[PDB]
Design a protein around this ligand. Structure first.
Ligand SMILES: CN(C[C@H]1CCOC1)c1ncncc1Cl
Ligand SMILES: CN(C[C@H]1CCOC1)c1ncncc1Cl
Ligand SMILES: [Cl-]
Ligand SMILES: [Mg+2]
Ligand SMILES: [Mg+2]
Ligand SMILES: [Mg+2]
Ligand SMILES: [Mg+2]
Lengths: 194, 194
């Protein structure tokens, strides 16, 4: 009963554009919305985010996250490993590649979500969330080598899955970092389960 | 090591603006980024709230209360946690309880409130507080919950059992064209992984 009539380009950059979307409201009245989109989608979705479960025997299971400066935020964020999917790449392949590049870890796909929206009131951006296990006992993961691409600068922070929310709160409290909403949502549900 | 040097307006809408951000990289080299921001943030500790609403009812499994809405940036229907922007002067907790009531009819009780978390930090400065709220579904105030949609709001309520959340979302996305929100999907994933 609601649907897009048209979009008016407001401003296009190299990586992001602003549109004015005209849409039919469910009363039959026509309305406008200021919407953001990337210019980079070609693609099941814009990006992948990797939930990476690091499994070492006789250790707590950890979730591997990354810390980076994020120029939109003017600060450092803690996030799942993630990046945009290349033209021609499957989400799974993007997932394993971004993981290795951002963490050095070599991972196995467990499951892959449908495209899920990042901030649907504002943008059209979507990602596939990709759950990956990391056999931390395997020789290839002994000395994980992060491969930063041009201008990427990423730190690895592995936290125990069993205390995840508490540990993220501590980092925020002590280190003035911003935790990602999806990382937080996952850390919350780990506590809320049962 | 990395900090913002300058922020230059590119295009300012009524709701959304695009900036050219200049930052210092960790090799000491200057770089730029195209950054999205809202025009609506003043002294609020974040732009918005999202509510994790746990519906509780004697001899019922706990449900997670979700909402389905047309999202003009997505050109489609999305399933999300109840959410809205924080009014000027409003606390995140007040915003959460208000938005929960407006979008679902339910009167909740605050359980916990996250720090400001980042929505899509490689793209925007948008932040929310994630507020967990319990709903006493045995109270008569929550018997026949009536959504109070604002001007241009038209929200459908969808309550799903916590203990089957991921499969029930999968089953909804197999029945019609519609996107599940990344924070919801992340939360439903963690409920499986725990
Ligand atoms: C945040 N708002 C305004 C309020 C009005 C009631 O619902 C949202 C936007 N409105 C149009 N285009 C973009 C945005 Cl971000
Ligand atoms: C998509 N990119 C660059 C790629 C290169 C490696 O990280 C993401 C952007 N570059 C500047 N401003 C905004 C965006 Cl979104
Ligand atoms: Cl797992
Ligand atoms: Mg990345
Ligand atoms: Mg990368
Ligand atoms: Mg809302
Ligand atoms: Mg609202």
């Amino acid at each position: 009963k609601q649907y897009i009539i048209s979009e008016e380009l407001i401003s296009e950059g190299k990586w992001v554009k602003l549109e004015k979307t005209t849409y039919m409201d469910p009363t039959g009245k026509t309305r406008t919305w200021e919407s953001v989109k990337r210019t980079t989608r070609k693609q099941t979705a814009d990006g992948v985010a990797v939930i990476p479960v690091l499994q070492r025997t006789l250790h707590y299971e950890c979730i591997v996250l990354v810390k980076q400066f994020r120029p939109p935020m003017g600060g450092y964020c803690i996030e799942f490993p993630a990046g945009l999917i290349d033209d021609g790449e499957t989400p799974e392949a993007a997932a394993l590649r971004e993981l290795e590049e951002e963490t050095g870890y070599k991972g196995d796909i467990a499951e892959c979500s449908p495209a899920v929206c990042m901030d649907p009131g504002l943008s059209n951006c979507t990602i596939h969330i990709v759950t990956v296990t990391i056999n931390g006992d395997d020789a290839e993961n002994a000395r994980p080598k992060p491969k930063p691409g041009d201008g990427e600068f990423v730190e690895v922070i592995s936290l125990p899955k069993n205390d995840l929310l508490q540990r993220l709160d501590a980092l925020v409290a002590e280190e003035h970092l911003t935790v990602d909403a999806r990382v937080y949502s996952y850390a919350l549900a780990l506590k809320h389960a049962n």
